[PDB]
Specification:
Blueprint lengths: L1 H10 L1 H27 L4 H20 L5 H8 L12 H28 L5 H6 L2 H20 L1 H4 L4 H8 L2 H11 L8 H17 L2
Helix pairs in contact: 2-3, 3-5, 4-11, 5-7, 7-9, 7-10
Bound molecules: protoporphyrin IX containing FE (2 copies) and decane (3 copies).
Amino acid sequence: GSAYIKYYIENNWVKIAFLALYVFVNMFFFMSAVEKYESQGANLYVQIARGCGATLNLNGALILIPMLRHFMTWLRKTTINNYIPIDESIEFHKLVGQVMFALAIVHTGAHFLNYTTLPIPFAQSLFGTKAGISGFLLLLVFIIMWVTAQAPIRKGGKFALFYIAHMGYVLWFALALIHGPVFWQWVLLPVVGFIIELVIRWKAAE
Ligand code: HEM
Ligand code: HEM
Ligand SMILES: CCCCCCCCCC
Ligand SMILES: CCCCCCCCCC
Ligand SMILES: CCCCCCCCCC
């Protein structure tokens, strides 16, 4: 109840601040994209779709970081771990993945609604544009990864199905790079993360 919550907040204030920053940064990129498209005379569907898209870039930058296992294991042993629990890296990964799935659904729905406002048939917008085709494929990949990563499957005896489907992350990243064609800079964060992971693996290697 109330007493437990006060205790929790006091003991995890850095973690809470981290998450509040995560929320704030999502809101900033979302609203920034909304304001941009709105100033161009875009309808509300476009504004929402673009807002989701901007936050999808942001979360796409973050999703892999907690899964750089040697880097997280190194970090767990630094004084950073006295402030924020690096053991919860997987819980942050899961959170970023759920947020992204919600945003992907909204982005998809908003783009579908925007397709109805065009003097072009729906099927030509969805299966006759680069963005439609790549987006649909990216959506399917993501649905497959998301469904199989849920605990009833992943922890309920179908770990192998989860694990093989999750190797789709490679395909996910390829498609995202093909789908969001102008702004590829988001991937610099994981690229840097991956270089740190390689350096750490090298240092520990024989
Ligand atoms: C059928 C499903 C989808 C459709 C119809 C769709 C449609 C679009 C369209 C029309 C754009 C603008 C492309 C451009 O400016 O050249 C776009 C951009 C983007 N989409 Fe999708 N998309 C879909 C699924 C997804 C999924 C599943 C994700 C992420 C997991 C995603 C992430 C993005 C991102 C990051 C951008 C670039 C930022 C932006 O302009 O909003 N999309 N999408
Ligand atoms: C686009 C979305 C996602 C990407 C790109 C992604 C990527 C990854 C990667 C690269 C790994 C490490 C794989 C390895 O061990 O070799 C991983 C592990 C994991 N991911 Fe995701 N992931 C996504 C979404 C999700 C979602 C939505 C969930 C859960 C709701 C999730 C749960 C996990 C879990 C639990 C692991 C750890 C498996 C284990 O160590 O037992 N992921 N993810
Ligand atoms: C403003 C948003 C802050 C989110 C913190 C929630 C912490 C829940 C830990 C279980
Ligand atoms: C979730 C949004 C539903 C999209 C409606 C589009 C109907 C297209 C058929 C012409
Ligand atoms: C009006 C014809 C629309 C056909 C498009 C099929 C959309 C598949 C949604 C998953």
